[PDB]
Design an enzyme around this catalytic site. Structure first.
Site, PDB file in Angstrom:
ATOM      1  NE  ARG A 224      -3.357  -2.670   2.487  1.00 24.16           N
ATOM      2  CZ  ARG A 224      -3.646  -3.507   3.485  1.00 24.16           C
ATOM      3  NH1 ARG A 224      -3.027  -3.412   4.661  1.00 24.16           N
ATOM      4  NH2 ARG A 224      -4.562  -4.452   3.304  1.00 24.16           N
TER       5      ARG A 224
ATOM      6  N   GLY B 286       1.024   5.981  -0.595  1.00 24.70           N
ATOM      7  CA  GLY B 286       0.421   7.291  -0.369  1.00 24.70           C
ATOM      8  C   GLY B 286      -0.798   7.550  -1.235  1.00 24.70           C
ATOM      9  CG  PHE B 287      -0.656   9.474  -3.982  1.00 32.13           C
ATOM     10  CD1 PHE B 287      -1.353  10.659  -3.770  1.00 32.13           C
ATOM     11  CD2 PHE B 287       0.705   9.440  -3.696  1.00 32.13           C
ATOM     12  CE1 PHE B 287      -0.704  11.793  -3.280  1.00 32.13           C
ATOM     13  CE2 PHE B 287       1.360  10.567  -3.204  1.00 32.13           C
ATOM     14  CZ  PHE B 287       0.653  11.745  -2.996  1.00 32.13           C
TER      15      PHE B 287
ATOM     16  CD  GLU C 233      -4.266  -0.748  -5.333  1.00 36.07           C
ATOM     17  OE1 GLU C 233      -4.147  -0.303  -6.498  1.00 36.07           O
ATOM     18  OE2 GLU C 233      -5.218  -0.446  -4.584  1.00 36.07           O
ATOM     19  CB  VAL C 234       2.668  -1.849  -4.762  1.00 36.49           C
ATOM     20  CG1 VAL C 234       3.750  -2.446  -5.667  1.00 36.49           C
ATOM     21  CG2 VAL C 234       2.860  -0.344  -4.584  1.00 36.49           C
TER      22      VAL C 234
ATOM     23  CE  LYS D 296       4.671   4.538  -6.038  1.00 34.78           C
ATOM     24  NZ  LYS D 296       5.829   5.263  -5.445  1.00 34.78           N
TER      25      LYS D 296
ATOM     26  CG  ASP E  37      12.010   9.556   1.033  1.00 38.96           C
ATOM     27  OD1 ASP E  37      12.094   9.903   2.234  1.00 38.96           O
ATOM     28  OD2 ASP E  37      10.986   9.014   0.553  1.00 38.96           O
TER      29      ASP E  37
END
Ligand code: GDP
Ligand code: ALF
Ligand code: MG
Lengths: 317, 339, 624, 64
Positions: free
Chosen positions: C172, C174-175, C177-178, C193, C290
């Protein structure tokens, strides 16, 4: 204890002759049983030579002085190289007459323009001995025969000091392919160069110069990484042929950087030698040179006596 | 000085020619022909239609046998028809798509064509192997090949858009003679019965009689207000007719070295594409850019008939050597034989 | 591989060869570089050509030499290559190479040294020999035709989701699921993704979605073992997809929380693989920003890759300055508002993680405070006090990596990652064995609602130049799976119709010997109320567009004269050509692939303009 | 640029000299000659005077 030695060189440079001398001096000398073995090959050299000379007169467009010898020329032309049993009457007088023709002699003196053989004058000047029913070739006759070597052969001779396992090989470009497969543990390399090559072109490629082929081939062998450990012995063979050729064919022409006096074997020798010595990438290495004649047992004894001593001085210590 | 004296000599020598012609002009052909009985009405009928070309037909030319004919078309093909049977003796595809002209040899063996390729491509029908093989690439012209006619199997005259004509030797592939003179693209040409003379029509609104033999322009005729699109010889070889974008045909006599007749009408406004005479010469057949193809009395100058069998411009037309029929190629993709 | 990759017929070559030549793609360096070009090119040399064969073999044996691991191997190998390809040919004077190249290799081999790029000068000179006539003979051959067929497939890639079987749900985000999926075409396993477009604008995150696509695009080329790379990007009307490398082993934060902290020798492994990952992005002037355990994913075997490229950044042109990333691992310059930074920031981020792998918390949050101004103040102010347990090798490393000053920061002084790799910590590691993933990983993992918001056309325009394919990837994927077997299959089906059309009536010699510029299949119509779609084989000539069916030559055509305009019009949401004809009449075309449609558009436009220019200055042919 | 204009203007005047140096014929005789040609060959011209359908290859027959 054995030692691997490579006899390397351009075609017809006297690699197989060098072996025949080692057998005379050290190994099993030439028996009179063995001497008969070459009789057939002697006859074939005389035919192969004469035929190659007959064709060359038609190429260069040289006239026969005696027109009678045109009949003998056709007679010889149709004789098969390999089907030679013996040297009998119908060809004996015809080939001697041919040779005695001054047109053939002009053709022979232009031997640089076509591929002949290196023992033709030796045999053709002595056709009386060759045509005798009980003609037994001498040890010289045996040294003079042209037997084109093809593919690697091992001839191990042993002096009372050490075993020398010598490797005779073929010189022509196609034969040099096979060379790779015994470049393993080489004690030393005996590179042969024919001094009389200077005014000749390759049989494998009638375009290019024979002396210059050897010049490249030497540089190739020298620079080979795994011979950095090995010793190099340069053999400038056919000294006695250069002594004839240089009287009419100038070295200045075929190698422009030659300053020395033309018609001099000794001045040419040294220049030619330097050309090969200057191809050494690092003078930190030492190339052992000798001017030699592979058909002269008395010369090869004296030379190889010094060469053996150099090999052992270096390789034992 | 030198160029102005030569310019004023030109324009006097020019007026010497006008007076030499006005001297001959005692009567007109319209006067002379008043008396002869009119030709009547030439009601012509479509005997054949030759379907095959996929697009516009630009040219056609009868064989001397009065039966076979080549035709070049926008579809890049050069077709040989059997007019009697409608069957195609050959359907030759070309190396250049831009063909504009074609020419059956009098020999029957060879046919020639060309176009914006600037080459007169010669083709062989009777080959060693019976195929349609290309004999020659006659290159040399520096403008579009507009038209060409065979003298025999080995000689051919060609007109071009480089404003020159040229005689070729098919063997040598070389321009034997070059007929320079025109100041405009040469649209058309025509061999006289005697292969020693030929005329040519150009955009300079003029035609010129050439000497094949020598290579000189003998006479130059003017009078058209626009491009000459087509030209051909009167049967005997003493006159020739020209079609023009000025909506008129004209007849010219060589020996009288001037215009004899005009063929035109207030109704006819679009240009002439092609012309041909009937075997006797009494009829002049003009192709037009209104899909029509009018039949003129060559002597009376009266419009005897109309061939109106095409939906698009009548681009090219011909008459057989035995005078037995009229072929007319067109932009609508069809040739049509008439009687 | 359930879905059959259909391969265009060899008649496609006429269109493609023109499509590729127009783009200068038909050069040796362009084609030989592509994997499928090399594979087709090398088959041609070996199977057909005589003097090409030994050059490819030389190139082959060298390429094997390069990938040899140990020196003891490379020493044995360097001789056989030399003895066979150099010496054997050089003795006979049939060795067509420079004295420079020969001397270069001897110069090395004599000194007993065997760099993996030892034969690199020979590689270049093998091209010179293959680049000339040999390349032209290949272009002339059937193998180039085959390359065009394969290249057509590539350039006509359009991806719905029907091309993927979806095996699991692996994440899951930010915008969205995967998933973990299999592409039906080849059977290659990938991670999808997938993002919801609506959620994007709802969290005004269109920037970091599009940034990810651009960053993934820059990174994905050049085969990289240590980054989650992209193969394809596409979208459905509401969903936005990336097809990434499949990391089924979960992330390094989870596995840390699970495992506890890691050993020094265990962390060394992860750091080294993350280092080569950072080296890759830095050599393409990208910064990750990041870098933290959660953004490191493990595969099945326990090897690692760097993930979420969303917050990444391109600094080749201009450097950023804002504070982007997780503020426990960010560097001083990133934090400093309006102070410019670059690759340097990643090495600071690395230190923070490598510390957190050994200590269980970032080196700045004390008592896991979760306070922005506390943590970030300590980043700017205070140096780490490295526990006495930390060996001196690690002491050296983290003191170098966690400088506030960028002039003293390790990896920033000049030589990038190679400085970090040299550190006495990684002194045990053979860094290529790191690259080749030959080091065994420390941890094999085991197996186990506001949708009412509206979606504008303005939003849909943003994702117009989104969909993408990466040639390297797709070609490799094909090379390693179907390529040989499709070739085997196509070889038959074509040979089958060669025998068929031989015995029926000799075909495919209509375009030959004329001035035809391009020929191929298309589909034609007229207007909606009468005609329908028909598949025909067209021939474009300078003045006309002929077309035919099987069993005939063309019985209908279209002149360039009468074509007024070619225009791209879509028919049922499908790109099509609109030919307006002089007599108020319309005529529409439709192609199999995008490359074909594009080339028929170009070549017709070129053709009719050039016809009308030409005809109009010829009095016979022109209207009036 | 006189050498081109002059070389051109000379060809013109040498050409006009060619064209003016011919013995022309009175138009009346030019016409009479052409009229009298048609008069001779009007019988041998099937386009002018319709021939029998039997003699016509484009009507009577399909075998040739
Ligand atoms: N006169 C003379 N003849 C030689 C010499 N070396 C070789 N030959 C002859 O020339 C031919 C070539 O020698 P050979 O050993 O067979 O050539 P290779 O083994 O291919 O190098 C043989 O017939 C030899 O007898 C030399 O130094 N002097
Ligand atoms: F070098 Al050889 F026969 F020519 F051994
Ligand atoms: Mg030998």
């Amino acid at each position: 204890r054995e030692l691997k030695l490579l006899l390397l060189g351009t075609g017809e440079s006297g690699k197989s002759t060098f072996i025949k001398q080692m057998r005379i001096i050290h190994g099993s000398g030439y028996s009179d049983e063995d001497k008969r073995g070459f009789t057939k090959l002697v006859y074939q050299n005389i035919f192969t030579a004469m035929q190659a000379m007959i064709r060359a007169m038609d190429t260069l467009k040289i006239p026969y002085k005696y027109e009678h010898n045109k009949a003998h020329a056709q007679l010889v032309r149709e004789v098969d190289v390999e089907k030679v049993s013996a040297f009998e009457n119908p060809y004996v007088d015809a080939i001697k007459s041919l040779w005695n023709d001054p047109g053939i002699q002009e053709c022979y003196d232009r031997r640089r323009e076509y591929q002949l053989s290196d023992s033709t004058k030796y045999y053709l000047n002595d056709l009386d001995r060759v045509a005798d029913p009980s003609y037994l070739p001498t040890q010289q006759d045996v040294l003079r025969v042209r037997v084109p070597t093809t593919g690697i052969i091992e001839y191990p001779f042993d002096l009372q000091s050490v075993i020398f396992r010598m490797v005779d090989v073929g010189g022509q470009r196609s034969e040099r392919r096979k060379w790779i497969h015994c470049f393993e543990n080489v004690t030393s390399i005996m590179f042969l160069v024919a001094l009389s090559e200077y005014d000749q072109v390759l049989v494998e490629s009638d375009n290019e110069n024979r002396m210059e082929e050897s010049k490249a081939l030497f540089r190739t062998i020298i620079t080979y990484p795994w011979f950095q450990n090995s010793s190099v012995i340069l053999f400038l063979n056919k000294k006695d042929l250069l002594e004839e050729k240089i009287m009419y064919s100038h070295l200045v022409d075929y190698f422009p950087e030659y300053d020395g006096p033309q018609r001099d074997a000794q001045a040419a020798r040294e220049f030619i030698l330097k050309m090969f010595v200057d191809l050494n990438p690092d003078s930190d290495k030492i190339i052992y040179s000798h001017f030699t004649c592979a058909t002269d047992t008395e010369n090869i004894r004296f030379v190889f006596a010094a060469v053996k001593d150099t090999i052992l001085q270096l390789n034992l210590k | 000085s030198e160029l102005d004296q030569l310019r004023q000599e030109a324009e006097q020598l020019k007026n010497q020619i006008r007076d030499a012609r006005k001297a001959c002009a005692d009567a007109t052909l319209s006067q002379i022909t008043n008396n002869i009985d009119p030709v009547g009405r030439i009601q012509m009928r479509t005997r054949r239609t030759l379907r095959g070309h996929l697009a516009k037909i630009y040219a056609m030319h009868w064989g001397t046998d009065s039966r076979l004919l080549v035709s070049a078309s926008q579809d890049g093909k050069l077709i040989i028809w059997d007019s009697y049977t409608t069957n195609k003796v050959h359907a030759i595809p070309l190396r250049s798509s831009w063909v504009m002209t074609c020419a059956y040899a009098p020999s029957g063996n060879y046919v020639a064509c060309g176009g914006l390729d600037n080459i007169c491509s010669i083709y062989n029908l009777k080959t060693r192997e019976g195929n349609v093989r290309v004999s020659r690439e006659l290159a040399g012209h520096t403008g579009y090949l507009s038209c060409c006619r065979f003298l025999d199997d080995n000689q051919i005259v060609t007109s071009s858009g480089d404003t020159t004509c040229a005689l070729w030797d098919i063997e040598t592939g070389q321009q034997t003679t070059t007929f320079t003179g025109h100041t405009g693209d040469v649209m058309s040409l025509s061999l006289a019965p005697d292969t020693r003379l030929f005329v040519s029509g150009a955009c300079d609104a003029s035609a010129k009689l050439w000497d094949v033999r020598e290579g000189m322009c003998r006479q130059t005729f003017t009078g058209h207000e626009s491009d000459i699109n087509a030209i051909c010889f009167f049967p005997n070889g003493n006159a020739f007719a020209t079609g023009s974008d000025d909506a008129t045909c004209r007849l010219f006599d060589l020996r009288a070295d001037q215009e004899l007749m005009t063929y035109s009408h207030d109704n006819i406004i679009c240009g002439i594409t092609s012309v041909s005479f009937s075997k006797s010469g009494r009829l002049l057949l003009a192709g037009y850019d209104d899909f029509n193809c009018n039949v003129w009395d060559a002597l009376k100058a009266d419009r005897a008939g109309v061939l109106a069998g095409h939906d698009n411009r009548v681009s090219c037309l011909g008459v057989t050597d035995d005078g037995m029929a009229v072929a007319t190629g067109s932009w609508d993709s069809f040739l049509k034989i008439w009687n | 591989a359930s879905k059959k990759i259909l391969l265009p017929e060899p008649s496609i070559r006429s269109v493609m060869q023109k499509y590729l030549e127009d783009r200068g793609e038909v050069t040796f360096e362009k084609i030989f570089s592509q994997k499928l070009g090399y594979l087709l090119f090398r088959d041609f040399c070996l199977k057909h050509l005589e003097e090409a064969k030994p050059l490819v073999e030389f190139y082959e044996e060298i390429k094997k030499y390069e990938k040899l691991e140990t020196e003891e191997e490379r020493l044995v190998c360097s001789r056989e290559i030399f003895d066979t390809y150099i010496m054997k040919e050089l003795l006979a004077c049939s060795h067509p190479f420079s004295k420079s190249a020969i001397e270069h290799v001897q110069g090395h081999l004599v000194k007993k040294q065997v760099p993996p790029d030892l034969f690199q000068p020979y590689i270049e000179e093998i091209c010179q020999n293959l680049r000339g006539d040999v390349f032209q003979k290949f272009i002339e051959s059937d193998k180039f035709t085959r390359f065009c067929q394969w290249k057509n497939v590539e350039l006509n890639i359009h991806l719905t989701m029907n091309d993927f079987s979806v095996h699991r749900i692996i994440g899951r985000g930010g915008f969205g699921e995967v998933y973990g999926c299999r592409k039906a075409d080849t059977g290659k396993m990938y991670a999808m993704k997938c993002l919801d477009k609506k959620r994007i604008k709802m969290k005004q995150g269109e920037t970091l979605a599009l940034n990810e696509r651009i960053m993934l695009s820059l990174v994905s080329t050049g085969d990289c073992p240590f980054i989650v790379c992209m193969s394809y990007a596409f979208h459905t009307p509401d969903k936005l997809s990336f097809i990434l490398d499949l990391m089924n082993g979960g992330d390094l934060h989870y596995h840390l929380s699970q495992h506890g902290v890691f050993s020094e020798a265990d962390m060394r492994f992860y750091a080294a693989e993350i280092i080569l990952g950072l080296e890759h992005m830095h050599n393409r002037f990208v910064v990750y920003r990041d870098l933290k355990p959660a953004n490191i994913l493990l595969d099945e075997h326990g090897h690692v890759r760097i993930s979420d490229l969303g917050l990444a950044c391109d600094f080749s042109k201009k450097k950023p300055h804002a504070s982007v990333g997780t503020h426990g691992y960010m560097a001083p310059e990133v934090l400093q508002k309006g102070v410019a930074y670059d690759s340097s920031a990643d090495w600071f981020s690395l230190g923070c993680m490598l510390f957190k792998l050994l200590r269980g918390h970032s080196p700045f949050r004390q008592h896991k405070t979760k306070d922005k101004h506390e943590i970030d103040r300590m980043t700017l102010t205070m140096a780490v006090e490295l526990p006495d347990s930390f060996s001196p090798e690690l002491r050296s490393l983290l003191e170098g990596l966690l400088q506030r000053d960028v002039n003293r920061r390790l990896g920033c002084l000049g030589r990038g990652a190679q400085e970090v790799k040299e550190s006495p910590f990684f002194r045990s590691l053979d860094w290529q064995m790191v690259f080749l993933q030959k080091y065994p990983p420390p941890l094999i993992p085991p197996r186990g609602d506001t949708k009412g918001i509206k979606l504008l056309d303005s939003d849909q325009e943003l994702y117009r130049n989104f969909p993408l394919t990466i040639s390297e990837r797709w070609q490799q994927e094909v090379a390693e799976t179907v390529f040989d077997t499709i070739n085997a299959e196509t070889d038959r089906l074509e040979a089958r119709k060669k025998t068929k059309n031989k015995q029926l009536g000799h075909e495919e010699d209509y375009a030959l010997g004329k001035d035809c510029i391009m020929h191929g299949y298309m589909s034609k119509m007229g207007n909606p109320f009468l005609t329908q779609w028909q598949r025909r084989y067209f021939y474009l000539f300078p003045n006309r567009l002929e077309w035919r069916g099987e069993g005939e030559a063309p019985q209908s055509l279209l002149t360039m004269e009468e074509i007024q305009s070619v225009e791209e019009t879509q028919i049922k949401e499908r790109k099509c050509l609109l030919l307006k004809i002089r007599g108020g009449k319309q005529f529409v075309l439709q192609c199999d692939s995008d490359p074909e449609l594009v080339q028929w558009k170009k070549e017709l436009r070129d053709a009719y303009r050039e016809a009308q220019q030409l005809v109009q200055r010829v009095p016979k042919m022109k209207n009036k | 640029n006189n050498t081109a204009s002059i070389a051109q203007a000379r060809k013109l005047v040498e050409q006009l000299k060619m064209e003016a140096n011919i013995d022309r014929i009175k138009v009346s005789k030019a016409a009479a000659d052409l009229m009298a040609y048609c008069e001779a060959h009007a019988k041998e011209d099937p386009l002018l005077t319709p021939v029998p359908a039997s003699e016509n290859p484009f009507r009577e027959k399909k075998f040739f």
